[PDB]
Design a binder for this molecule. Structure first.
Ligand SMILES: *[C@@H]1O[C@H](CO)[C@@H](O[C@@H]2O[C@H](CO)[C@@H](O)[C@H](O)[C@H]2NC(C)=O)[C@H](O)[C@H]1NC(C)=O
Ligand SMILES: *[C@@H]1O[C@H](CO)[C@@H](O)[C@H](O)[C@H]1NC(C)=O
Lengths: 97, 48
């Protein structure tokens, strides 16, 4: 069998859930597992094309196996956290950036 | 032995010198770069 993702005729016995968009979810599209926000995508996929990759060879667009709908995958929001403190001697109050 | 060149006029010349003073401040997220969303990869990276 050929494991590189493509229109997959053969799949295991997995019960599909409903497709939920615009929320940070774990997702499993035909064995492709990830975490992100799925949103409607304007990318136009050729029939043999089942997913899209970015410059890091990371899947950034996917095609829904049921509805054949193109979905952009965006990483769930993340960032750094900085703590502004006057100093424990001065006070225990802090601010969070 | 006895010849000197003396300026009889002048030019007010304005030139430019261009100096970089700062570069872009960049931050890198350890886990998100090495293990983007794989929790197992994050757990493995914890040992390093
Ligand atoms: C010193 O140089 C300046 C130019 O840098 C001379 O002024 C020029 O004189 C000519 C002829 O009189 C004019 O056609 C130009 O328009 C002048 N230029 C400016 C900017 O004024 C000046 O005459 C020179 N002085 C001496 C004593 O040679
Ligand atoms: C003057 O200059 C000439 C040639 O540049 C040189 O031969 C001579 O020695 C100089 N004068 C003196 C006193 O040295």
């Amino acid at each position: 069998f050929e494991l590189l993702h493509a229109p997959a005729t053969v799949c295991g016995p997995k019960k599909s859930t409903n497709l939920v968009k615009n929320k940070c979810v774990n997702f499993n599209f035909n064995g492709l597992k990830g975490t992100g926000v799925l949103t409607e995508s304007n990318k136009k996929f050729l029939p043999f094309q089942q997913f899209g990759r970015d410059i890091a060879d990371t899947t950034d667009a996917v095609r829904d196996p049921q509805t054949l709908e193109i979905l952009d995958i965006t990483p769930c929001s993340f960032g750094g956290v900085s703590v502004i403190t006057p100093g424990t001697n001065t006070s225990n109050q802090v601010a969070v950036l | 032995n006895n010849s000197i060149a003396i300026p009889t006029n002048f030019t007010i010349s304005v030139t430019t010198e261009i100096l970089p003073v700062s570069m872009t401040k960049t931050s890198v997220d350890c886990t998100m770069y090495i293990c983007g969303d794989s929790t197992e990869c994050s757990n493995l990276l914890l040992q390093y």
